[PDB]
A paper describes a structure:
Mitogen-activated protein kinase (MAPK)-binding linear motifs bind to the MAPK docking groove and represent a functionally well characterized linear binding-motif class. Furthermore, for extracellular signal-regulated kinase 2 (ERK2) the protein–peptide docking surface is comprised of a small hydrophobic surface patch that is often engaged in the crystal packing of apo ERK2 crystals. Here, a rational surface-engineering approach is presented that involves mutating protein surface residues that are distant from the peptide-binding ERK2 docking groove to alanines. These ERK2 surface mutations decrease the chance of ‘unwanted’ crystal packing of ERK2 and the approach led to the structure determination of ERK2 in complex with new docking peptides.
MKK2 is one of the upstream activator kinases of ERK2 that binds its MAPK substrate with a linear docking motif. In order to explore the structural basis of this interaction, we attempted to crystallize ERK2 with a docking peptide from MKK2 (pepMKK2). Single crystals grew in 20–25%(w/v) PEG 6000 buffered with 0.1 M MIB (a composite buffer comprised of malonate, imidazole and boric acid) pH 6.5. However, structure solution subsequently revealed that these crystals did not contain the chemically synthesized peptide: the MAPK docking groove was occupied by a crystallographic symmetry-related kinase molecule. Therefore, we replaced these residues by alanines (ERK2_AA) to ‘weaken’ the contacts in the crystal with a symmetry mate occupying the MAPK docking groove. We introduced a cysteine-to-serine mutation into the ERK2-AAG construct (ERK2_AAGS) and used this for crystallization. In addition, the bound peptides (e.g. pepMKK2, pepRSK1 and pepRSK1_QAA) were not involved in crystal packing in the new cocrystals. For flexible linear motifs this is more favourable in order to capture them in their physiologically relevant binding geometry.
Numbering used by the authors:
A (entry chain B): 4 to 15
B (entry chain A): 9 to 360
The structure:
């Protein structure tokens, strides 16, 4: 159940 | 045919790696994105030309030896190393790594992080660091530009050119004359002790990074060494007598007592919009005295990270890492041979 998501970031 | 080129510089990694695009330059290497035609993936490739100088060769050897020895989710790996078939022909070295989307320095120029992101980022940093510290290795140059990220918030620590084995006894006179991009992340004992490097220096850097995530500005900026120190004092306040009771070299403690007294500034005043659990532990991380400064395991085990802490899923090194020789001692012609041998395992014929 390991990886926490968490909304995506936006990268220039 | 001729080698691929980027900004007028030879970038000779074809035919395997093509479609180069410039990403950036550190002080030591030019970095590009590329396409690996053999494995059908995007990669980063770092070009390094360190052979004209002893310090550069030192950095290159350490980074390679360390990244090849470490395997951990939160530490950038090395996938491949390209260099000439003979030592006389080797003038550059190309290091191939997974392509990350950005670094934390670039991200922070463009946006403010939600507390959730900050928390997760912090956890991953400390998770990597625990691993590094388990091998008794100190990174010694943690800073936002050394923290690679992608859009899913995966984080990897990079840039181990200044790493070394933890030794309470080494002299500090190199590693100050030698150039680094910033200095805003250096622990105070580095500047005012005369001997050694301890695991506590990395923790201080992590604290500086957390502060920076909270406010989008570096907490201890400053132009030169004395200036830099003033910024630290102006926030933490003049050092307690117990604080001056340590490895602090004299001609520094005298310098310290020389200074007009300064008052501590409460954390919540500097960071009003910050989770209180974060400011505690920020406090524990940025303590002037290395001995009381929180350790990496403890920090992982602080309330702020409770939602992530998982000692079962936090790997450690099999054994301490070791350098056979003092790399400071070796001249550049020797380090060149060591780099040649170290990279041989990526060569077609290689023996073993
Ligand atoms: N694997 C990677 N994927 C994507 N971008 C990267 C990668 N590695 C480095 N970069 C970018 O290139 C910049 C410079 O790399 P860096 O490894 O820090 O070079 P340097 O001269 O060895 N160290 P430094 O001078 O402290 O930045 C980084 O700060 C990153 O933004």
């Amino acid at each position: 159940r390991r990886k926490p998501v968490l909304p995506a970031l936006t990268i220039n | 045919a001729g080698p691929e080129m980027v900004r007028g510089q030879v970038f000779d990694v074809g035919p395997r790696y093509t479609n180069l695009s410039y990403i950036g330059e550190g002080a030591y290497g030019m970095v590009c994105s590329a396409y690996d035609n053999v494995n059908k993936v995007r990669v980063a490739i770092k070009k390094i030309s360190p052979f004209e100088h002893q310090t550069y060769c030192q950095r290159t050897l350490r980074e390679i030896k360390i990244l090849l020895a470490f395997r951990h989710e939160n530490i950038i790996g090395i996938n491949d190393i390209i260099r000439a078939p003979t030592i006389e022909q080797m003038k550059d070295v190309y290091i191939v790594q997974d392509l990350m989307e950005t670094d934390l320095y670039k991200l922070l120029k463009t946006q403010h992080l939600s507390n959730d992101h900050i928390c997760y980022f912090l956890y991953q940093i400390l998770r990597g660091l625990k691993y590094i510290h388990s091998a008794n290795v100190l990174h010694r140059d943690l800073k936002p530009s050394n923290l690679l990220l992608n859009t899913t918030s995966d984080l990897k620590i990079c840039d181990f050119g200044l790493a070394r084995v933890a030794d309470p006894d080494h002299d500090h006179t190199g590693f100050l004359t030698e150039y680094v991009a910033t200095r805003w992340y250096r622990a105070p004992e580095i500047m005012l002790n005369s001997k050694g490097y301890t695991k506590s220096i990395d923790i201080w850097s992590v604290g500086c990074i957390l502060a920076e995530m909270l406010s989008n500005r570096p907490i201890f900026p400053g132009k030169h060494y004395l200036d830099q120190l003033n910024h630290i004092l102006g926030i933490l306040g003049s050092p307690s007598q117990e604080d001056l009771n340590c490895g602090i070299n004299l001609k520094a403690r005298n310098y310290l007592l020389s200074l007009p007294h300064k008052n501590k500034v409460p954390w919540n005043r500097l960071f009003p919009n910050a989770d209180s659990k974060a400011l505690d532990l920020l406090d524990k991380m940025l303590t002037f005295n290395p001995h009381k400064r929180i350790e990496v395991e403890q920090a992982l085990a602080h309330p702020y990270l409770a939602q992530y802490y998982d000692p079962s899923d936090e790997p450690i090194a099999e054994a301490p890492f070791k350098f056979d020789m003092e790399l400071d001692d070796l001249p550049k012609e020797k380090l060149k041979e060591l780099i040649f041998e170290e990279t041989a395992r990526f060569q077609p014929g290689y023996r073993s």
